[PDB]
Amino acid sequence: CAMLTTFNEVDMSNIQEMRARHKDAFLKKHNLKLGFMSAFVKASAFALQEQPVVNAVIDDATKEVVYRDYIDISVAVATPRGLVVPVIRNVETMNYADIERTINELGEKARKNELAIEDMDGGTFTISNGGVFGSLFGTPIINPPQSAILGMHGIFDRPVAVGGKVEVRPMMYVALTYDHRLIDGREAVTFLRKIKAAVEDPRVLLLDL
């Protein structure tokens, strides 16, 4: 076991304003609640596209890097009974209108206990959300056999310096645990920073920066 964790801060204001502006029409059309988790899942998929090493795995049996091209992100909808990780498959071709549908169905499966065995294995990324309980920032545990996991924590209003001026903005601490045997610090730090950039400004997803 070798878990290396890097933290970073994500400005939550842009996506909250987008939700407040577009929640009504989105709920009217797709019958879904607009949430901040779809933005994070899409950003994770995008950053995984840019940096495929985070998507790979090293087989301890043969000591060789095993690259994966398909992107599957497992979300944590952990039931009061215990921790459960439903898997979203092929997230690289979904928008914000999707993902929300998929997480809703997977949560429904978890509540009604149709979460079969195959729905929690074969994931390439994990987006465990411990912020629904108000955690400031903590270090999650790498889910085997995956090589990374992104931890989303609670949103709180803290003063942040913007252009030399103190402003109160809603900010999220985000964690990323990686195995240094495969991912070096440069790669994981860049990956987390790029996730932060994609969540902070959703237009880069359209610009492909």
Active site amino acids: 180, 184
Within 13 Å of residue 100, how many CA atoms lie on the same side as its CB?
Answer: 15
Tell which residue, 49, 172, 37, has the closest CA to residue 98.
37
Footprint of a second copy on residues 172-191 (CB under 8 A)?
Answer: 173, 175, 177, 180, 182, 184-191
The answer to whether the bond into 145 is cis (omega within 30° of 0) is: yes
205 binds a second copy (CB under 8 A): yes
Residue 36 contacts residue 15 (beta carbons within 8 Å): yes
**Number of residues forming the site for a second copy (CB under 8 A):** 82
Q: Which stretch binds a second copy (CB under 8 A): 57-65, 67-75, 114-122, 140-148?
A: 140-148
Smallest distance, Å, CB 97 to a second copy? 4
Footprint of a second copy on residues 36-55 (CB under 8 A)?
Answer: 42
State the CB neighbour count (10 A cutoff) for residue 131: 21
122 binds a second copy (CB under 8 A): no
161 binds a second copy (CB under 8 A): yes
104 binds a second copy (CB under 8 A): no
31 binds a second copy (CB under 8 A): no
Using the minimum distance from each CB to a second copy, give the nearer residue, 44 or 128.
128
63 binds a second copy (CB under 8 A): no
Residue 64 contacts residue 58 (beta carbons within 8 Å): yes
Smallest distance, Å, CB 175 to a second copy? 8
Q: What DSSP string describes 44-72?
A: HHHHHHH-GGGG-EEETTTTEEE---S-E
Radius of gyration of the chain (CA): 17
